[PDB]
Amino acid sequence: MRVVVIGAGVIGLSTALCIHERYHSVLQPLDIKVYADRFTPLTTTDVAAGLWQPYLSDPNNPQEADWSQQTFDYLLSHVHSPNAENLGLFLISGYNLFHEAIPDPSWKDTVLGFRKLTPRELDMFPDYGYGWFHTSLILEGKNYLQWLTERLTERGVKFFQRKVESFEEVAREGADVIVNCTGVWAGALQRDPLLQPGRGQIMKVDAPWMKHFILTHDPERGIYNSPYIIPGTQTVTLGGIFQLGNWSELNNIQDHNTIWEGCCRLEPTLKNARIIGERTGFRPVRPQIRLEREQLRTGPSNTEVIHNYGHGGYGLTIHWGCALEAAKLFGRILEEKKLS
Template structure:
């Protein structure tokens, strides 16, 4: 069975890995295709915290999170955890209201608790509440090249290719359009050459699928040399004297600071005004970061969607009679690291079912 995973960010790479790990390589011909690979994906820009919004989770979402947590727990116990940028980190998320609900996933992270009086008074004056917990950090900039290598060794092909706009929209037109254009030809070839296409194209899905529910939230993040920062601190809500919603996250070798979430903004150029805003916010809380050495500033587009699209779609080319299965897995917003490993397991389950179905058919 020929399977192609489109996208080489955290969602594509975890999907590809879990497909080969859970389904085995026998009878599976796997390829990963994307126009950008590490270090140039949005996932490489992410700080890497396993953390999520406090909004209500569905049963299915909670299952993804449990699977993701289980997988990372297993990875943490391997000797290569440091090589893939995986470690545990403690830290605070603070907010400006006292009536916020605890998140549904609070029992998945370790040692979840509300801040003490000392923390509220001395560390975060003005903030009303929040939580402290220990959770995973996974730095994609280290994990993705490792995953790529692992896929190579598992005999998965990796191809660099730009998919044309409208790729997923056009197949049904194949039979009603006589004017063959390059997008049609490309789509036709991709569809005819594969049995399963796993669509993990992040923000790119908006154009490829024509899904206008996918919108960017532009982020800008500064990597600094601040080895004295040992925790993760995320400040949310409008504070009377702290500009923006800054965060600081101690990483594997460096510290990341950020806090930019610009809904609907597409440009990826580094904006010096954003850099200033991030530094203003964070140095109000941590004066020790004034004059910190800046190593780089990067931007990325979080693929926001009301809900993650993880579902199977069947498309049929009436000319050839060929049916192709598409598994969409995109729209992981600002939390792709946390979701991806769990969503990837569901993708692998879907692929396994299709493989079994095909082998039953060929036995008949």
């Protein structure tokens, strides 16, 4: 039973591990391999702040609600031990800024201490008329990626730097199953005009004094496009830039400028931070995550493909859910192959 997982990103690695942890007992020669064009120092996943927080109303696909949920419980049930900071996982409270009023978020009750910004609080914010306050999780992109990797590697799972041209180049080369974890780049193996990139740019700056994330919103510019401050482990991230169809993986002046103005306006102590650096990446956007099976009809018999992409700008808030899902689906492939 040989398995190729494409994408060394959060999804790929989470689903890799999640399938392996689940099925090495109940399956003789489980071979797993990740094939990836870009590896952990250089993926989109590597760019995310890594705070957990689903959009503010509820999904096209009300199950995501459940996937985010459990991502949450899982991380939190791991929040004290020697592992936590390896992983780069730790707890963090902070703010949600809105002009007008707005209904509670579905999720309200997964997080701890969710509540509404009382008025002493909102004075602090002259540009804003309302918010929430709550304690959430960061799972920092880089670390999660580096640990997952050392767990996969202790599990005998084998990495390979490549471009996969198409499912069948890989069926062809030998594989009962293809877990498709390929992100914004999904479409280039099997067209899907539903997927598009949410371009983003953030600044990592020096501000250790920052102890709260602060998230503004402004539907006049939409989601993921109003300035945010996510204190990280080592450094604080500064963004607010979302833009459909932008395929420029390259830092932009105008964006910088927008990031830094809004962020300084939001918290002026930042005017003294030292910029460490800056980065772009591509949210894989889509009305809903794609995660289903597809028997790829292909020579003497059909290979099996699990699709697990389109997580957009909430990839880490969810990944674990997803991964436990593509694992279930995976099991099924098994019972059918009369192997379960």
